[PDB]
Design an enzyme around this catalytic site. Structure first.
Site, PDB file in Angstrom:
ATOM      1  N   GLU A   1      -9.562   1.770  -9.517  1.00 27.96           N
ATOM      2  CA  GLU A   1      -9.373   3.205  -9.343  1.00 27.96           C
ATOM      3  C   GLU A   1      -9.420   3.560  -7.869  1.00 27.96           C
ATOM      4  O   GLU A   1     -10.030   2.843  -7.075  1.00 27.96           O
ATOM      5  CB  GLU A   1     -10.489   3.980 -10.043  1.00 27.96           C
ATOM      6  CG  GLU A   1     -10.504   3.875 -11.552  1.00 27.96           C
ATOM      7  CD  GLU A   1     -11.495   4.844 -12.174  1.00 27.96           C
ATOM      8  OE1 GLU A   1     -12.514   5.153 -11.519  1.00 27.96           O
ATOM      9  OE2 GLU A   1     -11.254   5.302 -13.311  1.00 27.96           O
TER      10      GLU A   1
ATOM     11  N   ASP B   1       5.786  -5.905   2.266  1.00 25.37           N
ATOM     12  CA  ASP B   1       5.916  -4.882   1.236  1.00 25.37           C
ATOM     13  C   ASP B   1       6.019  -3.516   1.905  1.00 25.37           C
ATOM     14  O   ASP B   1       5.471  -2.546   1.422  1.00 25.37           O
ATOM     15  CB  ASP B   1       4.683  -4.948   0.320  1.00 25.37           C
ATOM     16  CG  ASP B   1       4.890  -4.279  -1.033  1.00 25.37           C
ATOM     17  OD1 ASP B   1       6.044  -4.075  -1.469  1.00 25.37           O
ATOM     18  OD2 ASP B   1       3.866  -3.965  -1.674  1.00 25.37           O
TER      19      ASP B   1
ATOM     20  N   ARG C   1       6.407   4.162  -0.144  1.00 26.72           N
ATOM     21  CA  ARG C   1       5.296   4.249  -1.082  1.00 26.72           C
ATOM     22  C   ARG C   1       4.012   3.624  -0.533  1.00 26.72           C
ATOM     23  O   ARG C   1       2.906   3.934  -1.012  1.00 26.72           O
ATOM     24  CB  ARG C   1       5.670   3.604  -2.423  1.00 26.72           C
ATOM     25  CG  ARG C   1       5.855   2.103  -2.361  1.00 26.72           C
ATOM     26  CD  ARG C   1       6.091   1.473  -3.736  1.00 26.72           C
ATOM     27  NE  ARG C   1       5.572   0.108  -3.777  1.00 26.72           N
ATOM     28  CZ  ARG C   1       6.207  -0.964  -3.309  1.00 26.72           C
ATOM     29  NH1 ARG C   1       7.417  -0.855  -2.765  1.00 26.72           N
ATOM     30  NH2 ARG C   1       5.630  -2.155  -3.393  1.00 26.72           N
ATOM     31  N   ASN C   2       4.150   2.748   0.464  1.00 26.86           N
ATOM     32  CA  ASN C   2       2.992   2.068   1.051  1.00 26.86           C
ATOM     33  C   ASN C   2       2.598   2.636   2.413  1.00 26.86           C
ATOM     34  O   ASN C   2       1.832   2.036   3.161  1.00 26.86           O
ATOM     35  CB  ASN C   2       3.234   0.561   1.108  1.00 26.86           C
ATOM     36  CG  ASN C   2       3.297  -0.047  -0.267  1.00 26.86           C
ATOM     37  OD1 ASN C   2       2.597   0.411  -1.175  1.00 26.86           O
ATOM     38  ND2 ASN C   2       4.151  -1.051  -0.449  1.00 26.86           N
TER      39      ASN C   2
ATOM     40  N   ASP D   1      -1.688  -0.617   2.148  1.00 29.42           N
ATOM     41  CA  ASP D   1      -1.265  -1.708   1.242  1.00 29.42           C
ATOM     42  C   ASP D   1      -1.495  -3.094   1.842  1.00 29.42           C
ATOM     43  O   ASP D   1      -0.558  -3.859   2.059  1.00 29.42           O
ATOM     44  CB  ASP D   1       0.204  -1.514   0.809  1.00 29.42           C
ATOM     45  CG  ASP D   1       0.689  -2.571  -0.159  1.00 29.42           C
ATOM     46  OD1 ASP D   1      -0.090  -2.992  -1.043  1.00 29.42           O
ATOM     47  OD2 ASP D   1       1.863  -2.990  -0.025  1.00 29.42           O
TER      48      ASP D   1
END
Length: 262
Positions: free
Chosen positions: A26, A138, A142-143, A156
Site C-alpha cells: 500500500e 522503466d 506514470r513513473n 519507481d
C-alpha cells in the site's frame, strides 16, 4: 562508501489515509514530525501483509537505492522504519501524483514554457541518474511524480516506452533511457495521450523498425518534436546524452522564440 536509509522512530509518523494499492503493498499519505524540526507531509509505502524475509529484503533494497540519490528531480527518501513491524519506506509527498494522471486531469491547462520546465526537470533527474551509471529501464510519465509547485521527479526504483535494441537484444543503457525520455516528452506535450494510440505492441515494433516515429502532438513546438526525434534515433549511439538534452531544453527556455514554430 554508500549512503544508507535513516531509521525513523515510528512515533514521528502519522499515517492519514491510504492513497494507493498494488502487488507490493500500500501507499499512504501522512505526516513526519521529528523533534526540533517542522512537520512535513510524506508518502508512506508499506509492504503487503504477510511478507516473507526475502520480500522484506527486496523491499528495503529500493530504499537503499533511493538513498544513494540527492537531487531535486529525484524522489527524496526521508528514511525507513525497520525496528518496528510492518516495515515502511518514507519519501517526500507529491501532492499532484503521477505525471500522466496529472496531465490527463489538466488537459490544455499549462503553458508551453511550463511543460518544457517539467521536461527539463525530468531531464535533469535523468542526467543525475545516468551520471551515476543507474539505468532506469522503466522511464514513463506514470513513473514521474509531481509536487504542488509542478516540480517533476523521477520515481519507481512496457513495449511502447522501450528502445528497439532493449526490446530486440535486451540491451538496456542510458541511451535506451533516452529513447524512453523522448516518449515521455511526447506524453507531456500531448497531456498524457497513449503513445502510438490503438496500435498493438506488434504493430509498434514493426513500425519503428520501418522508420516510423510519432508525430508532433497537437500544437507542439517543432523544436521540441525534433528533440523527440533525436531521442528516437535508431542507433543508440546517435541519440543525445542526457546532458545534451538538458542543455538543449535550457537553450529553448532561454530563447523562447525558438518555441514559436509549430
Amino acid at each position: 562508501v554508500r549512503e544508507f536509509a535513516k531509521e525513523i522512530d515510528a512515533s514521528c509518523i502519522k499515517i492519514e489515509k491510504v492513497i494507493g494499492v498494488g502487488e507490493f503493498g500500500e501507499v499512504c499519505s501522512g505526516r513526519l514530525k521529528v523533534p526540533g524540526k517542522r512537520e512535513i507531509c510524506v508518502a508512506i509505502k508499506t509492504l503487503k501483509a504477510g511478507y516473507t524475509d526475502k520480500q522484506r529484503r527486496d523491499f528495503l533494497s529500493e530504499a537503499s537505492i533511493m538513498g544513494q540519490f540527492d537531487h531535486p528531480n529525484i524522489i527524496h527518501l526521508e528514511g525507513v522504519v525497520t525496528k518496528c513491524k510492518p516495515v515502511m519506506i518514507i519519501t517526500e509527498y507529491m501532492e499532484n501524483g503521477s505525471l500522466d494522471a496529472f496531465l490527463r486531469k489538466n488537459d490544455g491547462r499549462f503553458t508551453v514554457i511550463q511543460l518544457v520546465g517539467m521536461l527539463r526537470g525530468i531531464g535533469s533527474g535523468m542526467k543525475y541518474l545516468s551520471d551515476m551509471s543507474y539505468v532506469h529501464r522503466d522511464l514513463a510519465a506514470r513513473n514521474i511524480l509531481v509536487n504542488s509547485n509542478l516540480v517533476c521527479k523521477v520515481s519507481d526504483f512496457p513495449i511502447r516506452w522501450t528502445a528497439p535494441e532493449a526490446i530486440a537484444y535486451r540491451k538496456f543503457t542510458s541511451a535506451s533511457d533516452v529513447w524512453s525520455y523522448g516518449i515521455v516528452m511526447w506524453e507531456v506535450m500531448s497531456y498524457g495521450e497513449r503513445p502510438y494510440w490503438d496500435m498493438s505492441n506488434q504493430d509498434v515494433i514493426k513500425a519503428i523498425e520501418e522508420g516510423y516515429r510519432l508525430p508532433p502532438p497537437m500544437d507542439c513546438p517543432i523544436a521540441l518534436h525534433q528533440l523527440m526525434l533525436d531521442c528516437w534515433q535508431k542507433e543508440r549511439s546517435d541519440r543525445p546524452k542526457f546532458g545534451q538534452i538538458v542543455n538543449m531544453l535550457d537553450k529553448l527556455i532561454r530563447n523562447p522564440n525558438s518555441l514559436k514554430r509549430t
